[PDB]
Amino acid sequence: AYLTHQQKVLRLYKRALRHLESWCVHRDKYRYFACLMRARFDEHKNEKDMVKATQLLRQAEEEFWYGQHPQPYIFPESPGGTSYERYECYKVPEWCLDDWHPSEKAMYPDYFAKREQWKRLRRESWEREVKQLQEETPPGGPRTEALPPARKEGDLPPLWWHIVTRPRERPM
Amino acid sequence: YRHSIFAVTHVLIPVWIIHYYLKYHVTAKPYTVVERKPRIFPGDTILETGEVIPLMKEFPDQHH
Amino acid sequence: APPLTLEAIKDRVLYVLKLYDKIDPEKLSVNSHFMKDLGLDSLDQVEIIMAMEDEFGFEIPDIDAEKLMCPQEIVDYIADKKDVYE
Amino acid sequence: GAHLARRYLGDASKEPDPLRMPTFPPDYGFPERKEREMVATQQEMNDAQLMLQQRDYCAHYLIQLLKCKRDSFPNFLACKHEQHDWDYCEHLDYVKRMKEFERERRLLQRKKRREQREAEMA
Amino acid sequence: MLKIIIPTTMLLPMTWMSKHNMIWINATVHSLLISLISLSLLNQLGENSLNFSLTFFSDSLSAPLLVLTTWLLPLMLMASQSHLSKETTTRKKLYITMLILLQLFLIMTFTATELILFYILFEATLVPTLIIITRWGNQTERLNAGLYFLFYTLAGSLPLLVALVYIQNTTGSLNFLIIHYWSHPLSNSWSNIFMWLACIMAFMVKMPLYGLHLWLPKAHVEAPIAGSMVLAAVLLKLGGYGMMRITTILNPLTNYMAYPFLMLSMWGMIMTSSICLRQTDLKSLIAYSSVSHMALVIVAIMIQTPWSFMGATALMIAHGLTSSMLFCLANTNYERVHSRTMILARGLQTLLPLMATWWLMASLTNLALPPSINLIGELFIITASFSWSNITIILMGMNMMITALYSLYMLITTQRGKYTHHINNIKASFTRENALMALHILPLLLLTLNPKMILGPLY
Amino acid sequence: AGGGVHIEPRYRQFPQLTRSQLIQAEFFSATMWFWILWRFWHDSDAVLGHFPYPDPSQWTDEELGILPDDE
Amino acid sequence: SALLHSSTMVVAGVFLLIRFYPLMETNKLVQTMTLCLGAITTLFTALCAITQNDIKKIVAFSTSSQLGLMMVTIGINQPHLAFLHICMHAFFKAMLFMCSGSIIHSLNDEQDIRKMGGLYKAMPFTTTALIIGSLALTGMPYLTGFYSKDLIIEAVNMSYTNAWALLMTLIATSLTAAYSTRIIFFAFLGKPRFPPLVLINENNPLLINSIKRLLIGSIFAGFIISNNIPPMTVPNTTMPLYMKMTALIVTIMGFMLALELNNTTYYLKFKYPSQTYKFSNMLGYYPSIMHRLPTYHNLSMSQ
Amino acid sequence: MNPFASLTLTTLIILTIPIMMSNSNIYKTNLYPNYVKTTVSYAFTLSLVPLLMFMHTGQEMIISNWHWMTLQTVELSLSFKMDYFSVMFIPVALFVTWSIMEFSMWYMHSDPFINRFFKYLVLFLITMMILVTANNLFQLFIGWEGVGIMSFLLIGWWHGRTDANTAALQAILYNRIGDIGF
Amino acid sequence: EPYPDDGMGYGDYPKLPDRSQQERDPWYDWDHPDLRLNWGEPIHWDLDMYIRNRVDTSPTPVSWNTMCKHLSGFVAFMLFMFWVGEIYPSYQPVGPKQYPYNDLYLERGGDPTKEPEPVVHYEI
Amino acid sequence: SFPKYKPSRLATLPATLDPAEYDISPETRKAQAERLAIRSRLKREYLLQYNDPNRLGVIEDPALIRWTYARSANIYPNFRPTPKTSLLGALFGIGPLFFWYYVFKTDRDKKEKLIQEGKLDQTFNISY
Amino acid sequence: DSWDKDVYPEPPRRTPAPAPQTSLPNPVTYLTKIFDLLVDRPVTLAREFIEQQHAKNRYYYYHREFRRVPDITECEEKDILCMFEAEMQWRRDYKVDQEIVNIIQERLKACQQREGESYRQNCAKELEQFTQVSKAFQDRYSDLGAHYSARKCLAKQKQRMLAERKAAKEAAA
């Protein structure tokens, strides 16, 4: 939804010292700076009518963007880094398990037996998880990208399969 | 022995079938293999005639 | 990279809270929720999120970085982010 | 370089331009131009396979350098002596070329004072 | 030469009287047999062509085309195995008849010894392909597809006919041997330039030429899988084979008024390649890349340099193959997903690794990577053009800018990358696709080692 | 894995540098110190510029063939 | 990346010119813009490596700066001097990426300079390998630099060349000596900057073996083949001494300028952002436009 | 004459052997990384034998082992420019490759495509050292794209990364700009 | 906001702001994170123009005009200042390479059958 | 002060720099709910059919085939021959062609001015 | 030497005589001695195998010869019988003329490499002899196009012929 000062200055403070640690590199310098931006960040947490609260905020973003480290540090496993989407090459969906060859099916029998009961609980709980979801769905479909749980008895939390059966973050 | 069989059929057989290839088939065809004459040097004797390529004359005697 | 476990990775983070001189070593709890169970609010939380991120390697997404706030609900995510059943 | 500075920043008429030099005959002020001679003749360097750019007047120690190097193998660490007397003609030829650059230079200075004294009197 | 003609003529009773189950098993098992029979035609003399009879003859130019057509015929059979399995048996026999009849008209066309006999069998091929494109097509526009096909080709074909009979009444024979030996300079009169216009625009249309090319995007894209390969692989190249044949009496006017065509090919080849890089339909890419390579060979014939005729033949077979795997590959994604949008299916090696292996080697074949005959033929065009004009390189060098800019582009968005987690339709690769893939690409590396036979008559 | 990791690490201490990698590091460091200063005196003329260069003002017109401003 | 894009296939392009040497240098003018093309690389590429928050860009730029030198020698009619340059080029540039990748493996997938410290004690052998590899490239007598980097700097210095074709070589060689110590500092000099989980290691003998098998190259290099190869270079013997030592001069102020800036990262103070730091890091903002502007316009025309 | 050529021509042959075992899949997975390591290592140690010929004799020589076709006055043949530039580049090159790919198998150890990677390095030398041995400029061009399109494949070792696919585009683009002049 | 309607062919299609697929939120649970797409939501006409692999429309720390000034200002300096050195090169004050045998012209390719005037020198 | 960033066609002004996105207003706050709802149902009709075990086929995107038809088919049914379209077609069609004609016609005859009274080099050019 | 020097002249073989004044055992020579014994001898015996088994049956081939036909010059205009022979004869001569510049090229190719840097003067006659081959080859065939013909070859030959014949008359003055 829309962003409010708290959500936004928390966003600000993330990037701000990400530049600062990348600016200073060595811990201790950035350490003294990071904790003093903290005081500099609370040096005005009592402002009057929200217009100034917004206007000073505008001054925060501009000096942030030109104080943004032009080459900032990004952790590789996260978006923008070396390891970002690196293992998506090894990512492979679960439906390739179904078309396994019968001779190869008998070479991994226990793992195919477990997928049989895993897809079994997929089917026997899919229809109940969805019917409950539509009846509890407010009119006009969903009002947000939320998901109802298995709040009742003997049910699975609706729309669980793909996110339960999501490929592991290190498919290797 | 791992190195040995690695020699015989990944090195020693390969040198056999190329050796058989160039000097017996490629050089059987003229001008396929060309050779610059070695930098024959005064005082040396050509194997056939033994002619001592003109012995070097005196030097302007530089020394340090 | 080892077979990283939730128990090992949380005991790393309970150190950070006990290494948080503001978060007293006695004030340590697996459910030390910062603004109301501890008092260090969202501003006094987001810098800790980067602090753990700086020592964790992963960068928890901002939508839940400010939100996952109780130490167990955070360590639930590194369990999710690393996706290890231990 | 001093020569570069004098040519551009100072005066190029008193500084040998590398392409325009030589601008004076070698007999002008330096008589008895008895043509110098190197040793190992053009067949020798041809039979030595000697590099065209290196077939200079120091060609004599060149080929004899590669003589012992032809038999210096296996040991590469050999023939230092005959290596650096070849450098001595290359030493001698270099200063001779250094001599050439300044000989024109000293003629270039003198040429200025010459025409200055044999054209400005009247 | 009825060694090859008759067994193909007889193939119609063969498929028609075959049993219910075999038909396709029958159709392939004998079409391969005819292929090695046509492989005999690799016997050329130096320059005197193989004159088998009064009406049929072949040379070093025709023979590579004959082997291409005859060996092609099994490929659309196996390619059409998947697409046309549901249909009843009688139309199954009829569809194979269209394929055999098409290859039948192709082999006689390439081997006619009289110009009009070539012409009657030149445009005789649209009649079966019109049936193939329109009846067995898939998408709605296929109706307008056929109309664009025949009308474009015919719009230039009839002027050729009027020109051909004129030469008959003027010289006394349209036979290739007689017209070659009695070749006379085509003067610069306004009557003669229109005669040149008549004898050239027919092939130029189904060359195609920049601007005169709309049929292929509106036909190959919506043509049936079998029909689509055959159009680009060989039915592109009747005009070419004709072009080097009729260019023996159009001198010297060719060197004087080929500039507008050399223009329109050079800018078009960059233009077609650039737009090829900016289509949302993958099938349009092979169509648009095809003309880009095809625009290159028109340059070859116009300068009519020996080196230009060298690569004209090689690139013809090279591209004629090249379009074949891509259309075969582009087919394989289609029926699996029932769409020809490259965006919908990305990174297929995570699901179909072996298909990806075939995809990339066909792609680098399109790149003209030596020693593949794709480059050497394409390269000879560059050398001839430089002899024609040293400047020529930059515009065509811009073509070695766009080709790989798109020819690996669908790779990194069809076979390479990540997969969308919603398509569970994608399954394992039936051995047919890889098998036909093998007979499709393995040749091009094979005769790569020995390029002289498919080099052309200028050897 | 379980049956390995003989470099078995821990948390927030020195990564148990076995002496090997240490005395290896000092070995080739000593070797390449030995190698490059050994020639720093064996054939120092190679880097020192064995042959000297003459300043050209230190020459006379007699040996240079320029006649003084009298002729 | 160490295998291809350090010195092994990039040199193929310049090796092509030295292959064409019998006709490469025949036209004096044709030589000229070689010095022109080569010089701008060295200024530009070494400038980029002056600030790079990684352990890969600096090596690549100092290569492209070097690839901007061999063809300078043929630009002054020196084929073999170019040819020996690439041989030593591969000898040390393979390592610089080799040890850098060791940091990426030992310290879990990290490349930027500003995420790790104390690599001297924790990573001794890779520290020694990086020291000598930079030492080899930064013109040092009796190693790769001597027979190649010292030889080229002196050769272009006394041969006929454009003033700026010379000028970049001394500047770039200083820059090569400059950012080589900049990464050495951020590598070893500085307190640990890696996550508390301590996993940095090199005990794997095979990695250790592979380093020492190329160590002999990185310190010995040309000497093993110096007198072995015949002399194709026309020597100068005597020549003025100031520009012959310039290579050893340009190294020293390349060092402490990095050192004092390294001490600015030691100095507790907010270092203001400046255009020069960004200019080096984003390649002078070159890919920001070339990878964005021309391709957008041409392909939008294709739409 | 008897030695020199045949030895280095074997070097080109012997490290091509890992490739057509790889296509025949005679390698047992993890054996191949060490298997190619060995073959490259002997490819080094054998390459010095032609090298030793150059230090003493200094001679060079060109081999034309095959003739592709004759374009009238141009008879394209499999000609190798084998010389000092060619022979000495061999041992330094692949020993460096032999040195690095060991560091690779330690580094590259988790991705189950070790073999696919290692062969990808193996054919990479094949295209390299044929450029330095090639005599006809066409053969040099063959290796010119050969490394170029293979850098594309090698840098695209991980199709999950779109920057890698992006990186290959300009890598081929800039390489293609170069070979226009070629 | 539909596309401008002037011989343009887009019609119903709306104006899409220049937001590339690299620029979109990489932390969002996109259905197709390949180019950060979702299900059903509208798509840009030039979507394939601005996708993560191809050109990107993303914010930069410093103004595009600034690149234009430095990129022009940077590159323009050398070929100008390198034009100056084209008149002013650098060398050593060393004379030419006087050579025996009429300056190699006997064996420097030049035909010696025609009178090869011997240019010989002496040590000055 | 400090250097100021500027928007561009590819270097667009960041949301952080633009104060307009910061202009909190009731119209924007109320507007976001609709996009939240429409994306919610789209996420819903993505997940149910995707997570449905019975959905063995391909779930098409209505926005996908609207674009594909748009980019190729809808052009001419909506095309209008405006004067600017003719001009752009002129400078991108016949225009560039005449560029190649004039440049290619010139050097061709320039070559033809060379051969006739023997001023062109043909020492090795025997592979015409 | 299946070839012969009259068509394939090669420089004489002159080798040096090493005098190893050094003391270290020459590794190069030992590499040869092990090489001929270990590599040559086994494959030589296999080569000696293929000799006498090839000798137990030696079928002979003979040269294919063509009688020289009347040329297009005496070939009657628009005639089709004797046009065939003369067109055949000219095209064989075309293929013939390509292989002799090829032979001079191959002779040219060997001359440089086998003579090292000395080829600058060692191929001086080899360089000159190509020019007369190439220039006369152009006069035989040039600007004939893909559809070259014996008639068009004579048309070019005639075109040059009266031009020089008129020039010779003009040169008489």
Chain A, 39-68: which have a CB under 8 Å from a chain J CB?
54, 57-58, 61-66
Task: Give which of H90, D80, D62 is closest to G226, Cα–Cα.
Answer: D80
> Are K138 and J123 inside 8 Å of each other by CB?
no
Task: Give which of A115, A117, A155 is closest to A135, Cα–Cα.
Answer: A155
Flag whether residue K39 sits within 8 Å of chain B, measured between CB atoms. yes
**HEC secondary structure over A109-144:** HHHHHHHHHHHHHHHHHHHHHHHHHHHHCCCCCCCC
Flag whether residue C63 sits within 8 Å of chain I, measured between CB atoms. yes
**Going by beta carbons, is chain E in contact with chain K, meaning 3 or more pairs sit under 8 Å apart?**
yes
Residue J24's region, left for phi above 0, alpha for psi from -120 to 50, else beta, is: beta
Q: Residues E311, E379: contact at Cβ < 8 Å? A: yes
Three-state secondary-structure class, residue E212: strand
d(CA E237, CA H34): 50
d(CA D119, CA E26): 110
Token pair 């009308």: residue: E151
Tokens of K164: 């020089």
Flag whether residue A100 sits within 8 Å of chain C, measured between CB atoms. no
Q: Residues H36, H125: contact at Cβ < 8 Å? A: no
Q: Residues G232, C47: contact at Cβ < 8 Å? A: no
d(CA D33, CA I122): 6
Nearest Cβ partner for J10 among G275, G296, G301 = G296
Three-state secondary-structure class, residue I32: strand
- How many residues are there in chain A? 172
Instruction: Tell me, yes or no, if C41 is annotated catalytic.
Output: yes
Task: Give which of A132, G302, J75, G46 is closest to E275, Cα–Cα.
Answer: G302
Tokens of G33: 């813009």
Three-state secondary-structure class, residue H81: strand
Which residue(s) pair with H79 in the sheet?
H64
Residues of E with Cβ-Cβ distance to J71 under 8 angstroms: 280
**Going by beta carbons, is chain C in contact with chain B, meaning 3 or more pairs sit under 8 Å apart?**
no
Task: Give which of E320, E308, E413 is closest to E359, Cα–Cα.
Answer: E413
- For I97, nearest residue in chain G (alpha carbons): G234
DSSP G130-150: HHHHHHHHTT-TTSHIIIIII
Provide the 10 A C-beta neighbour count for residue E91.
13
- For A9, nearest residue in chain C (alpha carbons): C43
Buried b (16+ CB within 10 A) or exposed e, F39-65: beeeeeebbebebebeebeebeeeebb
Q: Residues G228, H88: contact at Cβ < 8 Å? A: no
Task: Give which of H78, C53, C22 is closest to B33, Cα–Cα.
Answer: H78
Encoded amino acid at E422, one letter:
H
d(CA F49, CA H41): 39
H63 — phi, psi (to 5°)? -110, 135
Q: Residues G204, H106: contact at Cβ < 8 Å? A: yes
Task: Give which of G64, G127, G66, G140 is closest to G96, Cα–Cα.
Answer: G127
Tokens of I67: 């690149």
> Is residue G196 packed enough to be buried (19+ CB in 10 Å), middle (13-18) or exposed (0-12)?
middle
DSSP C6-52: HHHHHHHHHHHHHH-TTS-STT--TT--IIIII---SHHHHHHHHHH
**Going by beta carbons, is chain H in contact with chain A, meaning 3 or more pairs sit under 8 Å apart?**
yes
Task: Give which of E370, E122, E325, E156 is closest to E233, Cα–Cα.
Answer: E325
Radius of gyration, alpha carbons of chain I? 33
Q: CB pairs below 8 Å between D and K: how many?
A: 31
- For K130, nearest residue in chain J (alpha carbons): J124
Flag whether residue G235 sits within 8 Å of chain C, measured between CB atoms. no
Q: Residues H55, D76: contact at Cβ < 8 Å? A: yes
> Are B39 and D47 inside 8 Å of each other by CB?
yes
PDB experimental method:
cryo-EM
Flag whether residue D76 sits within 8 Å of chain G, measured between CB atoms. yes
Q: Residues C76, C31: contact at Cβ < 8 Å? A: no
Task: Give which of G221, D84, G153 is closest to F35, Cα–Cα.
Answer: G221
Nearest Cβ partner for H159 among E349, E397, E404 = E349
Min Cα–Cα distance to chain F from D8, Å: 19
H75 — phi, psi (to 5°)? -105, 95
Cβ within 8 Å of residue E306, ≥6 positions away: E384, E458, H72, J128, K145, K146, K148
DSSP I66-123: HHHHHHHHHHHHHHHHHHHHHHSEE--S------HHHHTTTTSSS-SSS---------
Flag whether residue B1 sits within 8 Å of chain H, measured between CB atoms. no
Nearest Cβ partner for E418 among A88, A95, A162 = A88
Three-state secondary-structure class, residue G76: coil
Three-state secondary-structure class, residue E377: helix
d(CA A16, CA C47): 10
Token pair 């050089």: residue: B27
**CA A148 to mean position of chain CA atoms:** 19
Tokens of E358: 């075939």
Token pair 């080097």: residue: E244
Tokens of D23: 């601008």
d(CA E217, CA G92): 54
Is beta strand I89-90 parallel, antiparallel or unpaired with respect to G161-162?
antiparallel
Residue E388 parent element (H or E): helix E373-388
> Are F65 and I124 inside 8 Å of each other by CB?
yes
d(CA K86, CA E112): 25
**HEC secondary structure over E317-366:** HHHHHHHHHHHHHHHHHHHHHCCCECCCCCCHHHCCHHHHHHHHHHHHHH
Three-state secondary-structure class, residue E211: coil
Tokens of G22: 């019998």
E208 cis-preceded (ω within 30 degrees of 0): yes
d(CA K40, CA E150): 68
Tokens of G165: 């074709």
> Is residue G75 packed enough to be buried (19+ CB in 10 Å), middle (13-18) or exposed (0-12)?
buried
Please enumerate residues of I whose Cβ is less than 8 A from a Cβ of J. Answer: 5-13, 18-19, 23, 31, 38-43, 45, 47, 55-67
> Is residue C62 packed enough to be buried (19+ CB in 10 Å), middle (13-18) or exposed (0-12)?
middle
Q: Residues G291, H170: contact at Cβ < 8 Å? A: yes
**Going by beta carbons, is chain A in contact with chain D, meaning 3 or more pairs sit under 8 Å apart?**
no
d(CA F14, CA E412): 44
Q: Residues G39, G164: contact at Cβ < 8 Å? A: yes
Measured at the alpha carbon of residue F64, what is the angle toward residues F62 and F65, in degrees to the nearest 5? Answer: 70
Measured at the alpha carbon of residue H172, what is the angle toward residues H171 and H175, in degrees to the nearest 5? Answer: 85
A91-94: Cβ within 8 A, 24+ apart: A91/A167, A91/A171, A91/E350, A91/E418, A91/E419, A91/H160, A92/A167, A92/A171, A92/E350, A92/E351, A92/E419, A93/A167, A93/E351, A93/E419, A93/E421, A93/E424, A94/A165, A94/A167
d(CA E155, CA E148): 10
Encoded amino acid at E347, one letter:
G
d(CA A16, CA A34): 9
Q: What CA–CA distances, in Å, run from E428 to A95, A96, E440? A: 11, 9, 20
Q: Residues E179, E173: contact at Cβ < 8 Å? A: yes
DSSP E34-93: HHHHHGGGG---SSS-EE-SSSBEE-TTHHHHHHHHHHHHHHHHHHHHHHTSSS-HHHHH
Task: Give which of E395, I70, I20, I43 is closest to H166, Cα–Cα.
Answer: I20
Nearest Cβ partner for E397 among H69, H159, H180 = H180
Helices (H), chain H: 5-14, 17-24, 31-56, 84-107, 114-133, 137-155, 162-181
Three-state secondary-structure class, residue H77: strand
Q: Residues K142, K156: contact at Cβ < 8 Å? A: yes
Q: What is the DSSP letter of H106?
A: H
Tokens of K44: 């030589």
G162 — phi, psi (to 5°)? -70, 150
DSSP G263-302: HHHHS-S-PPP-HHHHHHHTGGG-HHHHTTHHHHHHHHHT
Task: Give which of B55, E127, G212, A136 is closest to H102, Cα–Cα.
Answer: G212
- For G105, nearest residue in chain C (alpha carbons): C1
Encoded amino acid at E215, one letter:
W
- For K13, nearest residue in chain B (alpha carbons): B37
d(CA H65, CA H70): 15
Chain K, 98-157: which have a CB under 8 Å from a chain E CB?
145-149
Q: What is the DSSP letter of E249?
A: S
d(CA G239, CA G244): 8
Q: What CA–CA distances, in Å, run from K75 to E47, E185, E395, K67, K78? A: 19, 20, 46, 16, 9
- For H127, nearest residue in chain G (alpha carbons): G9
Min Cα–Cα distance to chain G from H8, Å: 19
Annotated binding site of B for cholate: 2
From the candidates C37, C41, C54, C80, give the one annotated as an active-site residue: C41
Residues of K with Cβ-Cβ distance to I111 under 8 angstroms: 124
Min Cα–Cα distance to chain H from J124, Å: 11
Span between the terminal Cα atoms of chain E, in Å: 23
Flag whether residue E280 sits within 8 Å of chain G, measured between CB atoms. no
Flag whether residue H14 sits within 8 Å of chain B, measured between CB atoms. yes
> Are I26 and A70 inside 8 Å of each other by CB?
no
Rounded to the nearest 10 degrees, how much is the dihedral formed by the CA atoms of A58, A60, A62, A63? 160
Tokens of F13: 């201490």
d(CA D62, CA D82): 8
**CA A60 to mean position of chain CA atoms:** 26
DSSP A2-20: ---HHHHHHHHHHHHHHHH
Q: Residues E281, E341: contact at Cβ < 8 Å? A: yes
Tokens of K1: 């030497």
H150 — phi, psi (to 5°)? -90, -30
Residue F63 parent element (H or E): helix F61-64
Q: What CA–CA distances, in Å, run from B38 to A28, B46, B55, K106? A: 69, 11, 17, 21
d(CA C62, CA C50): 10
Token pair 């949302």: residue: E280
Q: What CA–CA distances, in Å, run from E192 to C57, E93, E109, E173, J38? A: 80, 48, 27, 18, 69
Cβ within 8 Å of residue E237, ≥6 positions away: E65, E316, E320
d(CA E130, CA E144): 11
Q: Which of G28, G237, G242, G244 to mutate to test the interface with D (most CBs of D within 10 A)?
A: G237
Which residue(s) pair with H67 in the sheet?
H77
Q: What is the DSSP letter of J29?
A: H
Three-state secondary-structure class, residue H65: strand
